[PDB]
Design a protein around this ligand. Structure first.
Ligand code: ZN
Length: 135
């Protein structure tokens, strides 16, 4: 149930949200490669989703840390800056591997909150989680 996922491709790509279902975007291996001073992204599609469901954000982040030119090299997505599988792997591993890291946040007997469509939340109980703003 982890590796050999049961992806039916039901409205998880071009198929409009006509069919009701839960979109489980999680697949092993989701990190870039450190090459001198550039990141050779190969799964920009999968790596991007997990690292950030929204492509607009993920992209704004690579440039925000990319101190170099910043562009797509090769044929996949070899950017250049500071996105050396740093923030990428961290965020992705947070969601894809939220079970072993979040300690199976099933029915926590605490006050949990999630905002941004499974993007942000708090887990002061089973560790710590980022809600959104600091009041
Ligand atoms: Zn938790």
């Amino acid at each position: 149930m982890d590796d050999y996922e049961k992806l039916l491709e039901r409205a998880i790509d071009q198929l409009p949200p006509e069919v009701f279902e839960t979109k489980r975007f999680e697949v092993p291996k989701a990190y870039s490669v450190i090459q001198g001073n550039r990141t050779f992204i190969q799964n920009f599609r999968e790596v991007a989703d997990a690292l950030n469901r929204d492509p607009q954000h993920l992209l704004k982040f690579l440039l925000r840390e990319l101190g170099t030119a910043g562009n797509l090299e090769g044929g996949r997505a070899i950017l250049q800056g500071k996105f050396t599988h740093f923030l990428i792997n961290e965020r992705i591993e947070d969601y894809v591997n939220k079970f072993v890291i979040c300690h199976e946040c099933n029915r926590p007997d605490t006050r949990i909150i999630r905002e941004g469509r499974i993007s942000l939340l708090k887990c002061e109980a089973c560790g710590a989680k980022a809600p959104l703003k600091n009041v």
